[PDB]
Each structure stands twice: as structure tokens, then as C-alpha cells.
Symmetry: T
């Protein structure tokens, strides 16, 4: 189904763009958060962007395997991404975490659409790749929710 | 380091972060789109480079933070500050890709050298050491790229 | 489909309970088996309960991610578990292995039902989590069968 | 009791204590998972991980004590039914709990275990059961450190 | 299909073991007889491949065992079941060897995908996951080989 | 210098590769089909064996290459050169499987010893050392198998 | 400073070294001469034992040195001080060998316990701890051997 | 200044050793007496700090030895040379403890910077590098403490 | 319980922390100022010692905290509580330095033994174990120093 | 050659006995040497007995492989060994090292005879085993000679 | 030729040390001056080679010491004993550099084989084993170089 | 700017490579021929030194390459450029050998310092850092040697 592969590639292209944007956004929080929990969150944010760049690369490479070329420039990412960049510096810890949780959730719904497409079209490999990412997102979203709960 | 010198240094650091950020993604571009018999080796070399680049990206940004400034943290800002052009084409020859990273490494090298001079003259020993360390790894990579591209 | 999520959570709740019960049951065999193969089986049983407590923890956390709370007391486990506790001490090696094989098989059919639910409802993450567990169970069941075969 | 042989009254008394320790440790093991899963608050990640360290440590003591019991010629309690019957530790019935509330409770359970373990170490020491003495004392040492740290983090 | 599905899947698995077995030795052939300036790198790449192939070889065979079947375990059976031709020539060019492994990887890929589909439609989640994992590493290798062979 | 000695040695080496190749798969057969209370231990022992066998398989084949010959690299060739019978049955007792590998190890031992004598008498020190190393591990395994099978 | 207690403790320690020394070689005897289907596992278990025994051998001897005494350091002295009989037979059943080491472990356990009590009552905390640690590993081994020998 | 510059540098180094020594114990004080919900994390952070402090303590003292001087090596001397006040109170809040170490780190930073300037101007490259490396870790810690204390 | 005993034990612990603290720096003194052909080895041995000393320093101070007391945390307090004299001279012979640490280790050993007796008689099992562990490492070091200093 | 094998086994039996005796002799020095170089020699001696016990075990096992049974008791070792036990305690470092060097040299000549036998009879495996040991002995003998040289 | 053989062997060993020493530096020459697309891989291969060469360098020199001789230890002596010509040119092609090391490896191989024969015939088992081990690694490298240079 | 400064620096670097090369072999000389009770320790120390020396050898040579020059790569060139005399005698005292390496280390230190100054004044930050790092390790070794040789 040539229409399925194309639909999936379009989704993948967007994921790369969103991941790329998130990668830098996470550095923003990584650098500008402040508060008593600084060190822990500073490190958590790094774990996140390391994980994000990992998904960034595996998805981009899956795109390559599917015969497409991956978006590879900030210009393209800003044009494809559905994630807003963080413009402010100096941010509270709870505010930064709430924002990454929101972006993680946005990515989660976006990735789920792709997993459904891949599943229905028999693209087992893409299915597995997205599902693995979905699993780590789910764990992070849950933990963030738990730390932000009042 | 006096106030002024610090401001000049921060301005340089801000640009370095932007250039490193742009280079980081540019390297992925080559990482993904090069082709040729040497693919695997260069594919891996490119990764070593962007890992190294993102490392410098992070330490310089944090030095900027220590100096009391805030680091540029968005692609919009990077595109506005960077002196490095993004790679618009996909599917590229290995020698073409390497020649381009060599060129960008050289551009970064001259840029970083200006900062090391500023830091050195103003007594900013820490910034001096940080840039010099990066300068060292750049020099090594530039030399190796030159050797592999030499005809 | 919140309907499916509730069904899945109910299954997960039961899995946690069964795993919890198995965890202690495996210690029972771990401590009370006897026979020339003691050391090897003693160690195998430990590998099993370490593996079981791992599944115990990942399934419970998946339940948490799905918005539910995990059963967290022996009282609840005894009330939800479909696995009978080992009441006797001092047990033969073949008898102990035969029993864990049986419990592993029971868990396997139970987990399979959940994987089917998750698969049909698009819960890719839960699907992957259960399937991973199903894989290790399958391997263990096969090995136990091979060692018990006469 | 004599050099390498605690008297019947001593080994029996020690085994009874050990049986209870296994039961309490077993109950604590699951209780710690409860907090591990249901705490919430800004310190979540750190406490979530601390709780895991605790139950890993608890299950370690759980197993070494059970094995000591086996060595002493007894059989170890090995079912939740028996644990609930022997344990002096109440199970956590509520879900969703405050971090300070959860930590205060584990500190309380750790202290309860500490006093119970101390009785056993005294029994073992007086009866010459050097091995059991060393085993409980090692556990007592890690409990003491954890109790102190919890106290320090909960201090206002 | 139930006992009909497991039987179909086992038949596919039996073939996979056979093909993997044949590929395992075929890869050694290239491993030993390739020649050219890129020798060392390819020599090593080929080893990575047969290590990976023998890994899939064993996990699939064991899955077959779990499904209640016995695994083909002799070269005679493999030669009888395999759809992969053995390499009869020695002394082979690097691009020629890589092109051939890429072709066999692609053949395995289409074969494995059929099994993936069977397992998926019959609810054999475990077999599904096992083949999909293998399919993922094959896809990566096929892509890399394609990139290094691209002119 | 006696080309005759190197030719005789190569002929022996080619046979070793073939026998090792056949044993490699035969060991998997036992690995997969043994049954009995000692299953896990023997299952793992068999794997240690085929890992060891494939190691010897590779070093001997490469020695053959160094001597200027090409290594047999196909199951067809192995079946034609091997003096080791493939295991046709599945589902086998542990003592029966171990007795068979002990027998094959002993067969390999006498075969390898002939080669070590040839290499020793012709001054092929390297081949001598290679075979002797393998002979050492075989001796250890044969002894252990004998001890576990002793009644 | 109770010389009387220290002297009694040293006498015990001297004997422990002798017994451990004799056990060390006795364990090799079983290690080498046991036979049976469980060979490999017991062969390795026995090694774990003598490695552990030689460890106790060395720490106790050094404790003796710390207490101002000299350690018995010859087989002649060990044979003269040891309460453990040497194994004169070779070729032994696995259950027979394990039953014998269990017996020797139990003998050592009661002997060590006496020392533990001496050290405890005289305030020799260090010796107490050293023997108790050994007593703990002996207890675990004795229990395991009992479990494997239980019918 | 040759002999004059070396003497000035040694005088600075002697003070650094004294201050580091005092800080080392001061950090233990906080390490032991802080209290609050963040206890474990800060308890560990403080340890990282004193481990790092004692590291600088030792390298600077050894540099002093290399320069031909003897290092101050007693608490009496440290209390006499140190510009850092000892913590007399026990039981302290986390923010209060961190604020104090930040303050001491900043004091050390300005003090170390003077030495780096001296070393740089007199050509003492080695001392320069040593102090600058320490300055780098101090800068990072000062920044992080500032970030965690920011309201 | 018996608070009287706890107070006595805490008083001992407080002194141990003080002595350990003083020893820690004293060991650095020897570490830096010894000279002689055996320099490197002793230099390193001394470091092992102060690393070990600071470890005991920390565990004992924390035990004190657990017992409800606050630990002495300043050089001023240590100098006031310590029974160990600081080393005032620099440039010292290796045998002279080792003889002095042996002497301090022995002083600590007798001091620690009193505490272990107190803890033992009062049922403070944890403190008993902690001190005994330290007593064990001291005993080994004292014995080794004695052996290297023996003429 | 059933006669060469017998001669080799007789040599191996002696090696085991000598190694066994040396093992304990080295502990003697390990425990009783004294002098400024104590720690270093104390450690060197341990390296030696670890190495000796290694050769002890591999040679004994080779003996087993050759169809013989290994001497396994101090009584037999004292009866077969050509190495005298150290009867004195409290010994000088140079004195102890000189003695181990002498025992190493004695072992070296003894092992060489076996390597010659094995070589001439085609016992490649035994040849390699003894030669490997001969190599480590040669290195140790040379180093001891260098440290004892005046 | 008991002692005549040792002298002949020592003479050979002395030459090997000299040749290895010269090769060591020659390999650095290629390591630094090769150029071409395969640069990084060959650059690293060359390093593996000189690390391996310096390893043989040291074990052979030490064997010489064990045999009662003194090892040549100066470039002057090496240049006087070595049969390997130093590389005088800078900037060299990759195939040209590899062809040269292959040639030097082959030269060393024939040289080493003569020593192996000497040692074997004179019963110098240790030297035999040492040279044979080196001969084995040389054989593999020579074969690989041959394969990468083959056209 | 200043192609004169780079030329002067390269000339210095070329000499450093030559001296390091010569020292590398000289250290092996002592490594092999020293004798005395401290043999093992010094034997090992010397190895640490030549490993460290060959490390500096390699990094400086590479820096030279980066600066656009070619590195001296032959013993003939090294003997022509080196200011370090080769050790002609074998069999040497330990104190005599250490005194000589200390002397050569000091010679290298003053030579390296001149380069450090040149690089510093000409803004060659990278070379500055490279030499300074080496200068640091030399300083520590010189100090330790001085301490072990002090009477
Ligand atoms: Fe990638
Ligand atoms: Fe960062
Ligand atoms: Fe968890
Ligand atoms: Fe256990
Ligand atoms: Fe397997
Ligand atoms: Fe290979
Ligand atoms: Fe020892
Ligand atoms: Fe130091
Ligand atoms: Fe601490
Ligand atoms: Fe063994
Ligand atoms: Fe050496
Ligand atoms: Fe290099």
C-alpha cells in the first residue's frame, strides 16, 4: 500500500521535527530552571534530552529505510514541528516540568497515531519502534504527573 | 575579567552555542544522507562528531550561565545568531560531506580562537581552558579530515 | 475507548496479585527443595523470583500510568490471586519445578488474554509490556518442560 | 547454651524470632512497593528510588534470615497467609499518599524492626549463636543508618 | 485457523532456521574470501553479521521448540529446506560480496514478514515480537548495505 | 620448504574445518533436543562447546588461508569432506547426547593429533601451536565428559 | 592484657590453619576424582570451596601473626596438628565426596565456634569477627550440602 | 620575577592548602548536621564536594612540594593560615548550609584567581593549569548552588 | 535500655572522630614529607591509610549522629579532644614516619577496644560491629608496619 | 607408547607434589618475612603461590586426562616431593627470595625434563602445558636474580 | 650444542629486538604520514601494529635477559643490528604504506622462523613458544594485509 | 599572523619528538638492566614512564602534523636532533638509573617550558595546553624521583 508508507513517512518526518525541537527545548529548561530541586531536575532533563535525541535518530533512520530522506535542518524542523520553542529563560522547576509533561503528552498522542497506521498497514518494524518510544514516554509522563501532583 | 570583557566574551559564547547547535543537526544530515563504499565508517565518524559537538554545546552554554548570562535556547535564536549555513540538500557524497564539515570545523576554530584570545587577555582562565580544550579536539579532527580528503 | 482501559486495568490488577503470590511461592521452593540438584535449582528459583518481581513492578507501574492504583498489600493479593500458595515445606525438586511450570502456564494464558485485549484496543504499550513477559515465560515453560520430561 | 551448641530453649526462641522477622520483612517488602507506587510530590523521583533501594535491601534481609532459619533446622514461613498471621506490621491500605507521610511510616516500621531485631541479637549473643548474631547485627546496622537518614529528612 | 495457524508458523520457522543456518556459513565464506582495500572493515562487518545471524538462528529455533515442534538440526535438512543458495566461489570482490548479502537479507526480510503477518493475525504475540525484532535489525543492515553500495 | 608437507597439512586443515562445521550444528541439535533433570546445565555446556568449536572452526580456516589455500565454505563441501555423521534424531537423553559428543571430540582429537605431528615434523610451528591449543581444550572436555558419564 | 586467653586463642588458630591446609588439599582430591552425571557442577563447587578455604586459611594465619605468634607453615606441622584425616582414596562417588566435606565442614564449625567463644569472652573482638565471618560461610555451605544430600 | 614570583605563589598555595583543609572538615559538618526533606541529595552532594576539595587539597600541596617548599600539614597551621571560618553550629538548615558553602566556594574562587594571575604573569604554566582546573570545578559548583538557592 | 552507657559510648566516639581527624592530616604530612628510596611505595601506602582513616572518620561520626548526639566538626574541637599529637616537622625519614603511624595506630587500637568493650557490655551491637571492623583493619596495618620496621 | 606416557605421568605426579609443597612454603615466607620491603615482597609471594597453585591444578588435571590419578594428600606430597619444607619462621627478605629462586630453578630443571619427554613422545598437549609454566618460571627466576644481585 | 645453541639464539634475539625497535618507529611514520580516504581505519590499524610490535619487542628482549645476555638498548645499536630500512619519506599513499609493512612483516617472519627452528632443535621450549606466538600474530597480519592489497 | 612563531614552535616540537623517542628506548634500557632489592618496583615505574613518554611522543608529533609540518620519524633523524644521550651501558644500579632519568626529565622540562613560553606569547593556545599537560606530569615525576633519591 503506497498510500500507507507515504502516510507513515509524513508522520515520521513530523516526529523528527518535534523531537529535534524538544531536544533544544529540554536544554533550555536544563539550563534555566532554578529552585531547591535544581540538581535533580537538571539531571533529569539531561536524561530526557538524551532519550529524546535517541528517538530522534532511530525514527529518522527508520524514515531513511522506508526510502524517504529525513528533515535535517532547524529551518525544516521549525516548519514541520507542532511544538512551540521556549522563549523565556529563568523558569521555575514545576513550571518547566509541567511544560515537558505537556510536550511529552503531545508527542504521545502523535506517536500513537503513527503506531495505529503502522499496525493497520503491517509495518511491524515501524510499529515496534514507535511502541518502544511510546513506552518510555508513558513512564516519563506518569512520573512527571506524580512529581507535579499536589 | 572586567565587566566589558565579560560582555564581549558572553557575546562570543552565545554565538558558539548557536553555531554548535546548527552544526549538531547539520552533522546528522550528513550522518543520514551520505552514501558510498566508506558509508559505515563515515556514518560512525559523523556520530562521534555530533556527540563531541553537543558536548561542547553544553559546556559552553553552561559557562555562559556561570558568567551571569542566559544561553540562547531555541532554534529560532540559533538560526538568528549562527554563522553556519544549514545543509539543505540530502543525498550527498562522502568526500563532499567531509569537506563541508572540515570547512565548518575550521570556521569554528577561527571563531573559538578569537574567544580564547579575549579570555586570555582578560584573565578569564576558566573560559580560556574551556575553549582551548575544544580547540584541541577541533584541531585534531581538522587535521584528520584533511588527511582523508588529501588527493 | 475507556471501556477497554477498564478491562485491561482489571487484568493488570490480577497480574500484580498473581505475580506477588508467585514471588513468595518461589521463595518457598527456593528454601525447601532438596535433592542432588539442589544448588542449581535453588539458583534457578532465585532467577525466577527476580524475574517475577521485575514483571510485578513493570505491570504495577503500567497500571499506574493507565490512571489506576495498584493493589499493594498481601490481603488484596490473596483476594485477587488465582494462584494457590504453597502450604507445604520440604518438597522434591521435580515436584517443585512441576508446580512452577504449572503456575507459569497459568500466568501465560492469563497474560495472553490481556495482550489480546491491549492489541484489539490499540494499547500498544501494554501490549509490548505483556508480550515481553510472555516471551520470558515461554522460554521458562519450555525449559522446565525439557528438564521434567521423562 | 555452650560454645558451639545453643540449648534447645535458646535455638527455639531464636527460631521463633527469626520466623517473625521473615514475616515482618515480607509484609514490609510489599508495603514499600505501595509507597513506591503511590507517593506524589515534588520529591517523587528521589523518594521513588529510595523506596526501591529499601525494598531491595528488605528482601535481601528477608532471604538471609529465612536461610539462617533453615540452617538452624527449622522451616521458613513461606506464604502470605502465614506472614499476615505472624507479622506485627500493619499493611498499607490507602493509595495516594504524601511523601513525608510515607517516609514517616517506613521510619516507624524500621524502628519497630530495629527493636525486634535487637531482641534477637541479644538472644543470639547470650546463647553463643555467633552466626545469627552477626547476621542480625549487619541488618541492624543498615536499619540504623536508614532510620537516622529518614529522621534527618523528616526533621522540621 | 488455530492448530492450522501454529502449524503454518512452525513451517515458516523451520525454513527460517534453515536459511539462517545456510547464511551463517555463507557469511563466513565472504568473511574469508573477500579482498580489497576495505578488507578489514568488511571482514569485521561480516563477522558482526554472522554473529547476529546465528543469534536469530538460535532464538527462532527455540521458539519452534516452545511451539511444540522440533527444530531442523543438520546441514542435510538445511540444504533441503533453505531457499538460500550457498556461495560456491572463493576469492570475491567486496562490492560483490556485500551486494549478495544485501540480497539474502532482503530475501530473509520478505520471508520473515510473512511469518510476522501470520503470527500477528493468529495472536501469536511472542513469535510476532521475535520476528519483528529480527526484522528491525535486518532493515537497518539492508539500509546500510544499500548506502555503502550506492553509486 | 617441502611443498608436499604444506599440501598434506592443508588437506588435513580442510577436513578439520568441515568436521568442526558439522559438529557445530550437531551440538545445536543436542543443545535443543536433550531432556532430563540436568537439562539447563547440559544445555549451557553444549553452548560453551559449540562456541568453542566455532572458534576453532574460524582459526583453522584462517590458518588455511594463510597457507595460501582457500577454505571450504559451504555445507555441501562440509558434508562431502566431514568424517562426522550428522545427528538425525531429535529428542535425546542427556547421557546419550554427551556420550556422542565425547565420541566426536575423541575422533577430532586423533585427527588433530595427526596434523600436529605433520606440522611438527615439517617445521610448521604456527599450525603446530594452533592445533595443539585446540588439542588442549579437547583433552580437557573429553576428560570432563568421561568423568560425568562414568558409572 | 590476658596472655592466658591470647595463648589459648593462638593455640586454636594454629590448629585452624592446619585443618584448613589439610582440607584445602582434600578438596582438590574430590575436585579431581569425583565422577558422576553431576560432575561439572560439583567439580566447580569443590573449587569454590577450596578457594574459600584457602581464604580463611590465610586470614586466620595472619590473625595469628598479629597476635604475636608465628603460623604453622609446612605440611609436616599441619599433619601433626590437624584433626582432619586426609583422603587416601581416589575415584569417589559424588554423594560420598559431598558427605565427607559436609562432615569436615561441620567439624571445623564446632572447632571454630569454640574459638569464637574464647575470643568473645576475652574481648578479642577482631578474632571474634574473623571467626564469625568464616562461621557464617560454613553454616551456609553446610546447609546447602545437607539439602543436596537429603533423600 | 623568578625567585620572587615563586615565593609569592608558594605563599598563596600554602594558604589554599590551609583553606581547603578547613573547608574539608566544614563540609563534613554540613554533611552530618543538615536536615530537611532534601537531606539525602544534599548529604551526598556535600560528600562529592569534600571529596573534590580534598583532591584539590592534595594536588596543590604537592605542587607546593614541587616548587621546593614544604606544605603546611597540621590543623594548628591551617587554623593559623586559613581565611575560612569553621562552622561552630550543629543542626543546620539545608538552604543555610548551601548558602555558606557557596560563600566559601566564592571566597576560594577569588583567592585562586589571584594565584592563577600570578602564575600566568610569571610563566608558571603548571601552577596556572592546576589552579585553573580547580577554578573550573568551583565555577560550576558556584553556579549550581546559585541556581538551587535562587528564589 | 541504659542511657548511661550510650553517653559513655558517645563520649568515646566523639574522641575517635577527633583523633581520626587529626591522624588524617598527620598522614598527609608524612605522605608529603617522607624521603628515601622507598618513597613511592610508602607515599602510596600513606594515602591508602588516610583514605581508610577518613572512612572510619565518617562512619564513626555518623554512628554518633544515629545515637542522638552531634559530631565534633571543626579543627578547633578536634585539637581540644584529640589525644594524638600533630606532626610539627616536615622532611622525615621513612622508618621514622612509619614508626610514628604504627604508634598512633596502636594508640587508636587500645582506644577503640575500650569502646568495643563498652558497646559489647551494653548491648550496642551496631557500634560494636562498627568499631570491631575498624579494629580489624588497624590490626592488619599494625602487624604489617611492625613487619616492615622489624630489624 | 605406553611407556612414554608412564614416564610422563611419573614426572607429573612429582610436579604436583613439588608444587603442593612450594605452595605452602611460599605462604611461610609470605607470613614470616620482615624488612623494609615487606609489603612488596609479601604481595609478590602471594602472586607466586597463586601462580603455583594454578600450575598445581593444571598439571594434576593433565595427569587425570592421561588416565592416571593425581596425588592428593600431604602425606603423598611429602613422600614424592624433592622440595624441602621451610622449618624456620622469621626470615630475612633476601634470604626468603634466594630460597624461592632456588626452588623455582629446581622446578625449572625438573619441568624441562618433562617437556623433553613430552616433545620426543609426541605428547603435544603436555608439552605446551609444561612449556607455559616454564615460561612463567623463567621470568620469575630472572626477576628474582635481578633483585638479589649485588 | 648446548651452550653454542644458546649463543646462536641470543644473537638472533638481539637482532629481533633491533628490527622490532626500528619497525616500531617506522610504523609511527606511516601512522602519521599516510593519507587517503581510508585514513582513519589504517591510522588505527598501524597503531594496533606498533602496539603489538612493541609488545614483541619487550617479551623478546626479556627472554634475552633470561638467557643471561643483555639486550641492545639504544637506537645506535638498533641501527647497527637491524636489517630493516627506516622510512625516510613523509607523505605516503595508504597502499604503499601497507605494502611496505607487509614486506617488513614477511622479513620478520622468515627471521623469526629461523630462531624458532634453532630453539626447537636445541630444546629451548620457552624461546620456541615465545617466537611461535609472535609468528602466529605475524601470519594473521600478513594474510590480512595481503587480502586488503590484493587487486 | 606570525608564520615565524609557528616555525619556531615546530622546530621545538620536532626536537621534543626526537628527545622523547630517544628517552623511550633509554627507559627500556634501565627497565631491563637495573638490579637491586627494589628491582620489581623500579622495573614497573620505568615502564609507567616509557608508556607516559611514548604518549607525549605521539601527541606532540600529531600537534606538529596539525601545524602543517611533518614529524621526524626515524631513529636516524632522532639521533641527529636529540639532545639526550643514549645509555651505552647495561647492568646499572637503581639509584644510578633513577638519577639519570631525573636528569633527562629535568632537561625535557626546561626544553618544554621554552616551547610553552613561545606558544603562550604567540597565542598558540592548543600547543600551550599540550606542552603544559606534559610539563605537569614531568613536574610530578621529577619531584617523586627527587624524593626517592634524597639522602
Ligand atoms: Fe544514526
Ligand atoms: Fe548540562
Ligand atoms: Fe518500580
Ligand atoms: Fe536464597
Ligand atoms: Fe540456545
Ligand atoms: Fe574470522
Ligand atoms: Fe596473606
Ligand atoms: Fe598525594
Ligand atoms: Fe557520610
Ligand atoms: Fe581444577
Ligand atoms: Fe619489560
Ligand atoms: Fe597517533
Amino acid at each position: 500500500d503506497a498510500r500507507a508508507i507515504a502516510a507513515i513517512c509524513e508522520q515520521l518526518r513530523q516526529h523528527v521535527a518535534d523531537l529535534g525541537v524538544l531536544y533544544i527545548k529540554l536544554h533550555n529548561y536544563h539550563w534555566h530552571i532554578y529552585g531547591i530541586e535544581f540538581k535533580q531536575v537538571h539531571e533529569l532533563l539531561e536524561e530526557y534530552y538524551v532519550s529524546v535525541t535517541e528517538a530522534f535518530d532511530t525514527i529518522a533512520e527508520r524514515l531513511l529505510q522506508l526510502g524517504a530522506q529525513a528533515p535535517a535542518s532547524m529551518a525544516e524542523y521549525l516548519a514541520l514541528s507542532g511544538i512551540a520553542e521556549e522563549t523565556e529563560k529563568e523558569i521555575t522547576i514545576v513550571s518547566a516540568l509541567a511544560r515537558v509533561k505537556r510536550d511529552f503528552e503531545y508527542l504521545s498522542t502523535r506517536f500513537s497515531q503513527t503506531q495505529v497506521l503502522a499496525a493497520e498497514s503491517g509495518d511491524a518494524v515501524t510499529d515496534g519502534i514507535i511502541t518502544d518510544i511510546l513506552r518510555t514516554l508513558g513512564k516519563a509522563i506518569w512520573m512527571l504527573g506524580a512529581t507535579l501532583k499536589a
